[PDB]
Design a protein around this motif. Structure first.
Motif, PDB file in Angstrom:
ATOM      1  N   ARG A  75       2.089  11.582 -13.349  1.00 42.36           N
ATOM      2  CA  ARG A  75       1.705  11.959 -11.893  1.00 42.36           C
ATOM      3  C   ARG A  75       0.215  12.415 -12.325  1.00 42.36           C
ATOM      4  O   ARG A  75      -0.339  13.312 -11.920  1.00 42.36           O
ATOM      5  CB  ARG A  75       2.367  13.208 -11.496  1.00 42.36           C
ATOM      6  N   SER A  76      -0.729  11.338 -12.496  1.00 44.47           N
ATOM      7  CA  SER A  76      -2.097  11.386 -12.557  1.00 44.47           C
ATOM      8  C   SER A  76      -2.665  11.760 -11.186  1.00 44.47           C
ATOM      9  O   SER A  76      -2.224  10.935 -10.244  1.00 44.47           O
ATOM     10  CB  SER A  76      -2.573  10.088 -13.218  1.00 44.47           C
ATOM     11  N   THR A  77      -3.741  12.399 -11.140  1.00 47.49           N
ATOM     12  CA  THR A  77      -4.122  12.776  -9.886  1.00 47.49           C
ATOM     13  C   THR A  77      -5.314  11.884  -9.570  1.00 47.49           C
ATOM     14  O   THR A  77      -5.870  11.201 -10.143  1.00 47.49           O
ATOM     15  CB  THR A  77      -5.001  14.306  -9.876  1.00 47.49           C
ATOM     16  N   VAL A  78      -5.784  12.028  -8.158  1.00 47.43           N
ATOM     17  CA  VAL A  78      -6.573  11.079  -7.476  1.00 47.43           C
ATOM     18  C   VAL A  78      -7.518  12.110  -6.674  1.00 47.43           C
ATOM     19  O   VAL A  78      -7.267  13.253  -6.329  1.00 47.43           O
ATOM     20  CB  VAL A  78      -6.069   9.975  -6.555  1.00 47.43           C
ATOM     21  N   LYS A  79      -8.642  11.471  -6.067  1.00 51.99           N
ATOM     22  CA  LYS A  79      -9.605  12.142  -5.172  1.00 51.99           C
ATOM     23  C   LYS A  79      -9.717  11.431  -4.076  1.00 51.99           C
ATOM     24  O   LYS A  79      -9.495  10.246  -4.105  1.00 51.99           O
ATOM     25  CB  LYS A  79     -11.056  12.586  -5.857  1.00 51.99           C
ATOM     26  N   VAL A  80     -10.553  12.158  -2.884  1.00 51.10           N
ATOM     27  CA  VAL A  80     -10.682  11.431  -1.671  1.00 51.10           C
ATOM     28  C   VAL A  80     -12.132  11.264  -1.442  1.00 51.10           C
ATOM     29  O   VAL A  80     -12.999  12.173  -1.549  1.00 51.10           O
ATOM     30  CB  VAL A  80     -10.028  12.224  -0.626  1.00 51.10           C
ATOM     31  N   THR A  81     -12.478  10.229  -1.062  1.00 55.58           N
ATOM     32  CA  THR A  81     -14.057   9.626  -0.592  1.00 55.58           C
ATOM     33  C   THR A  81     -14.213   9.519   1.070  1.00 55.58           C
ATOM     34  O   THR A  81     -13.358   8.796   1.391  1.00 55.58           O
ATOM     35  CB  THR A  81     -14.252   8.461  -1.448  1.00 55.58           C
ATOM     36  N   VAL A  82     -15.445  10.058   1.314  1.00 49.91           N
ATOM     37  CA  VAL A  82     -16.012   9.817   2.686  1.00 49.91           C
ATOM     38  C   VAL A  82     -17.538   9.565   2.485  1.00 49.91           C
ATOM     39  O   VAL A  82     -18.089  10.147   1.826  1.00 49.91           O
ATOM     40  CB  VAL A  82     -15.551  10.955   3.556  1.00 49.91           C
ATOM     41  N   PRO A  83     -18.029   8.365   3.295  1.00 45.96           N
ATOM     42  CA  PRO A  83     -19.412   8.104   2.860  1.00 45.96           C
ATOM     43  C   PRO A  83     -20.135   9.507   3.357  1.00 45.96           C
ATOM     44  O   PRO A  83     -19.907  10.278   4.113  1.00 45.96           O
ATOM     45  CB  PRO A  83     -19.558   7.220   4.131  1.00 45.96           C
ATOM     46  N   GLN A  84     -21.295   9.400   2.702  1.00 47.47           N
ATOM     47  CA  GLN A  84     -22.006  10.704   2.684  1.00 47.47           C
ATOM     48  C   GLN A  84     -22.990  10.770   4.204  1.00 47.47           C
ATOM     49  O   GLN A  84     -23.111  11.679   4.859  1.00 47.47           O
ATOM     50  CB  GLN A  84     -23.021  10.641   1.404  1.00 47.47           C
ATOM     51  N   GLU A  85     -23.411   9.549   4.486  1.00 49.18           N
ATOM     52  CA  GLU A  85     -23.978   9.534   5.715  1.00 49.18           C
ATOM     53  C   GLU A  85     -22.880   9.487   6.735  1.00 49.18           C
ATOM     54  O   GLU A  85     -21.832   9.132   6.257  1.00 49.18           O
ATOM     55  CB  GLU A  85     -24.861   8.323   5.795  1.00 49.18           C
ATOM     56  N   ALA A  86     -23.065   9.815   8.153  1.00 43.88           N
ATOM     57  CA  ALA A  86     -22.271  10.024   9.142  1.00 43.88           C
ATOM     58  C   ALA A  86     -20.812  10.879   8.713  1.00 43.88           C
ATOM     59  O   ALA A  86     -20.014  10.825   8.959  1.00 43.88           O
ATOM     60  CB  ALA A  86     -21.508   8.681   9.447  1.00 43.88           C
ATOM     61  N   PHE A  87     -21.636  11.990   8.169  1.00 43.19           N
ATOM     62  CA  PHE A  87     -20.653  13.054   7.815  1.00 43.19           C
ATOM     63  C   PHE A  87     -21.613  14.348   8.012  1.00 43.19           C
ATOM     64  O   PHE A  87     -22.743  14.279   7.341  1.00 43.19           O
ATOM     65  CB  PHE A  87     -20.234  12.841   6.228  1.00 43.19           C
ATOM     66  N   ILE A 121       0.865  -1.042   0.079  1.00 44.75           N
ATOM     67  CA  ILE A 121       0.015   0.132  -0.064  1.00 44.75           C
ATOM     68  C   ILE A 121       0.930   1.182  -0.015  1.00 44.75           C
ATOM     69  O   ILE A 121       1.799   1.269   0.782  1.00 44.75           O
ATOM     70  CB  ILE A 121      -0.963   0.102   1.328  1.00 44.75           C
ATOM     71  N   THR A 122       0.620   2.188  -0.864  1.00 40.44           N
ATOM     72  CA  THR A 122       1.207   3.508  -0.856  1.00 40.44           C
ATOM     73  C   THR A 122       0.195   4.650  -0.436  1.00 40.44           C
ATOM     74  O   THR A 122      -0.814   4.558  -0.990  1.00 40.44           O
ATOM     75  CB  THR A 122       1.670   4.043  -2.308  1.00 40.44           C
ATOM     76  N   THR A 123       0.672   5.357   0.610  1.00 42.58           N
ATOM     77  CA  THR A 123      -0.085   6.526   1.190  1.00 42.58           C
ATOM     78  C   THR A 123       0.415   7.673   1.164  1.00 42.58           C
ATOM     79  O   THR A 123       1.641   8.260   1.310  1.00 42.58           O
ATOM     80  CB  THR A 123      -0.204   5.964   2.709  1.00 42.58           C
ATOM     81  N   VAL A 124      -0.674   8.718   0.830  1.00 49.76           N
ATOM     82  CA  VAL A 124      -0.129  10.133   0.560  1.00 49.76           C
ATOM     83  C   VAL A 124      -0.007  10.843   2.128  1.00 49.76           C
ATOM     84  O   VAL A 124      -1.144  10.401   2.788  1.00 49.76           O
ATOM     85  CB  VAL A 124      -1.146  10.907  -0.109  1.00 49.76           C
ATOM     86  N   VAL A 125       1.018  11.173   2.556  1.00 48.89           N
ATOM     87  CA  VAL A 125       1.262  11.727   3.749  1.00 48.89           C
ATOM     88  C   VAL A 125       1.051  13.271   4.096  1.00 48.89           C
ATOM     89  O   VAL A 125       0.346  13.686   4.759  1.00 48.89           O
ATOM     90  CB  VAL A 125       2.756  11.163   4.521  1.00 48.89           C
ATOM     91  N   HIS A 126       1.941  13.889   3.355  1.00 51.97           N
ATOM     92  CA  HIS A 126       1.799  15.281   3.164  1.00 51.97           C
ATOM     93  C   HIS A 126       2.077  15.754   1.792  1.00 51.97           C
ATOM     94  O   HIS A 126       2.729  15.128   0.869  1.00 51.97           O
ATOM     95  CB  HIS A 126       3.036  16.084   3.790  1.00 51.97           C
ATOM     96  N   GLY A 127       1.511  16.828   1.429  1.00 53.55           N
ATOM     97  CA  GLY A 127       1.355  17.119   0.207  1.00 53.55           C
ATOM     98  C   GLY A 127       0.018  17.212  -0.439  1.00 53.55           C
ATOM     99  O   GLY A 127      -0.768  16.217   0.050  1.00 53.55           O
ATOM    100  N   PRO A 128      -0.087  17.428  -1.936  1.00 55.68           N
ATOM    101  CA  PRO A 128      -1.174  17.150  -2.620  1.00 55.68           C
ATOM    102  C   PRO A 128      -1.102  15.706  -3.250  1.00 55.68           C
ATOM    103  O   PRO A 128      -0.112  14.866  -3.272  1.00 55.68           O
ATOM    104  CB  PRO A 128      -1.233  17.975  -3.671  1.00 55.68           C
ATOM    105  N   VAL A 129      -2.384  14.901  -3.057  1.00 54.84           N
ATOM    106  CA  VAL A 129      -2.543  13.580  -3.542  1.00 54.84           C
ATOM    107  C   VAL A 129      -2.173  13.379  -4.750  1.00 54.84           C
ATOM    108  O   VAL A 129      -2.634  14.171  -5.644  1.00 54.84           O
ATOM    109  CB  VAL A 129      -3.877  13.072  -3.351  1.00 54.84           C
ATOM    110  N   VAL A 130      -1.157  12.400  -5.195  1.00 58.42           N
ATOM    111  CA  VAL A 130      -0.836  12.267  -6.716  1.00 58.42           C
ATOM    112  C   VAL A 130      -0.399  10.835  -6.732  1.00 58.42           C
ATOM    113  O   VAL A 130      -0.153  10.458  -5.848  1.00 58.42           O
ATOM    114  CB  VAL A 130       0.178  13.380  -7.259  1.00 58.42           C
ATOM    115  N   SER A 131      -0.238  10.432  -8.047  1.00 58.98           N
ATOM    116  CA  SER A 131       0.056   9.180  -8.270  1.00 58.98           C
ATOM    117  C   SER A 131       1.413   9.204  -9.002  1.00 58.98           C
ATOM    118  O   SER A 131       2.122  10.197  -9.156  1.00 58.98           O
ATOM    119  CB  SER A 131      -1.004   8.515  -9.450  1.00 58.98           C
ATOM    120  N   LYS A 132       1.923   8.061  -9.298  1.00 58.77           N
ATOM    121  CA  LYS A 132       3.426   7.744  -9.732  1.00 58.77           C
ATOM    122  C   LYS A 132       3.643   7.175 -11.195  1.00 58.77           C
ATOM    123  O   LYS A 132       4.563   7.410 -11.591  1.00 58.77           O
ATOM    124  CB  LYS A 132       3.920   7.049  -8.650  1.00 58.77           C
ATOM    125  N   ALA A 133       2.699   6.168 -11.626  1.00 60.02           N
ATOM    126  CA  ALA A 133       2.899   5.150 -12.549  1.00 60.02           C
ATOM    127  C   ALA A 133       3.310   5.768 -13.985  1.00 60.02           C
ATOM    128  O   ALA A 133       3.833   5.668 -14.848  1.00 60.02           O
ATOM    129  CB  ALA A 133       1.862   4.061 -12.670  1.00 60.02           C
TER     130      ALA A 133
END
Lengths: 315, 22, 45, 49
Positions: free
Chosen positions: A184-196, A169-181
């Motif tokens: 450097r294609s970007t990603v987005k972050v998901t959180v469930p809509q309920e319980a938010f 597993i590769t995890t973004v720690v600090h900085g903007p989220v980005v890929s490597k392969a």
């Protein structure tokens, strides 16, 4: 007799040609002559970049923003192979053996451990007793209320190389989220809509709009067990806590029975951390999971700059 | 995977057009 | 060991673009010859 | 003036190439100038039986 127009393309071509940065220097090792030529170019570039004597040797005229990648290894039971890329994950600490598994955790895994979204989480995890084996003192750490100190946020995952038992597993720690392969294609972050809970609308001259809106994370011990909540706010670290306490007051009123007058170790109602910063004036996007028993609506937010914070006491 | 396009020509590895190459 | 060393290439292979060549002299004689050749490779060695 | 000799010994190191070990028998190596051209990164095999 054409008009020639009002604006000229030569100017635009020239200024943009000036704006383009010089190309990266490929080095060709397989062929001898190409290697020698690139080495000649390298020595000329160092002569052109470090000599205060000349002026064309001054090149600094007119940012490095990938993320800091950190790799974790986890068991293939404590993680679905299907779980979407970019979901924030939270980590746990083992006592003696750490190399075996890291035991990184997902929000649905926390919802399972803590006891619609329930059915989705069970369709991901039918027999989550390994989940109970990952934290032996779960029943102890709910009461010792030391549960938040050990759950350290890791943030969104980029890649997960799939193996039988272990997972890479590769995890973004600090900085903007980005890929490597790729470039450097970007990603987005998901959180469930309920319980938010959107705390900018929970209380809703004109209130001012800041540039950046932040996402916080908080962990609350209610009589109906512990539970986790992430908050999309923008005002300030000094006001989000106050507004959150005002929010939780109806749930805080219930804790008169559980608290112990003699032992003061259980009193804390929760802690708040700050995960990262995203663009305001936009909102977020709505999507459902595409798994076998997928019914949960989920918010997903673009432009996530991962700047994790610590747990701060609130009561 | 790029359904609606034309197939122009083929690069070859191994100097043989048989199915063995990529 | 038998023969003690193996013979191989010396630089990484590159890819050739030889898909299309037909821009020259579409004609009946070469047409017949091409059909005969590409059908005769099946049986003959 | 001239002075005493000095006793120096320089180690000899054998340098390696990938194409020069037997490991290159298992692989098939080609030269791809930029990997950014391969964006999709998926290859479809069409097997006939």
């Amino acid at each position: 007799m054409k008009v020639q127009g009002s604006v000229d393309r030569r100017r635009l071509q020239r200024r943009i040609a000036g704006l383009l940065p010089p190309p990266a220097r490929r080095l060709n090792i397989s062929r001898g002559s190409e290697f020698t030529r690139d080495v000649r170019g390298l020595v000329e570039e160092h002569a052109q970049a470090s000599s205060l004597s000349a002026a064309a040797v001054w090149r600094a005229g007119l940012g490095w923003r990938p993320p800091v990648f950190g790799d974790f290894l986890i068991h293939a039971s404590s993680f679905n192979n299907a779980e979407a890329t970019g979901t924030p994950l939270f980590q746990f600490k083992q006592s003696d053996p750490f190399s075996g598994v890291d035991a990184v955790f997902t929000p649905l895994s926390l919802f399972i451990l803590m006891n619609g979204l329930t059915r989705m989480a069970n369709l991901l995890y039918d027999s989550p007793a390994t989940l109970a084996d990952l934290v032996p003192d779960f029943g102890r750490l709910v009461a010792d209320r030391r549960f938040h100190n050990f759950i350290t946020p890791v943030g969104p995952l980029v890649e997960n190389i799939k193996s039988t038992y272990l997972n890479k597993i590769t995890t973004v720690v600090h900085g903007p989220v980005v890929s490597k392969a790729i470039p450097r294609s970007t990603v987005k972050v998901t959180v469930p809509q309920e319980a938010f809970v959107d705390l900018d609308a929970w209380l809703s001259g004109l209130q001012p709009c800041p540039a950046d809106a932040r996402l916080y994370v908080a962990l609350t011990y209610e009589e109906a067990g512990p539970r986790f909540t992430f908050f999309q706010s923008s005002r300030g670290h000094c006001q989000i806590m106050n507004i959150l306490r005002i929010y939780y007051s109806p749930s805080i009123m219930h804790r008169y029975a559980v608290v112990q007058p003699l032992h003061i170790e259980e009193l804390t109602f929760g802690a708040v951390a700050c995960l990262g910063t995203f663009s305001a004036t936009d909102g977020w996007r709505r999507s459902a999971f595409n798994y076998r028993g997928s019914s949960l609506p989920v918010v997903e937010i673009d432009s996530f700059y991962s700047n994790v914070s610590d747990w701060e006491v609130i009561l | 995977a790029a359904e609606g396009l034309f197939h122009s020509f083929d690069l070859l590895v191994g100097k043989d057009a048989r199915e063995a190459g990529i | 060991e038998a023969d003690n060393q193996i013979m191989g290439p010396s630089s990484y292979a590159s890819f050739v673009v030889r898909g299309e060549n037909l821009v020259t002299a579409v004609s009946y004689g070469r047409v017949m010859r091409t059909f005969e050749h590409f059908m005769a490779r099946i049986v003959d060695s | 003036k001239f002075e005493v000799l000095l006793g120096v010994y320089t180690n000899a190191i054998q340098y390696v190439r990938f194409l020069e070990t037997a490991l290159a028998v298992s692989c098939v190596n080609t030269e791809f100038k930029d990997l950014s051209r391969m964006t999709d990164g998926k290859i479809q095999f069409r097997i006939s039986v």
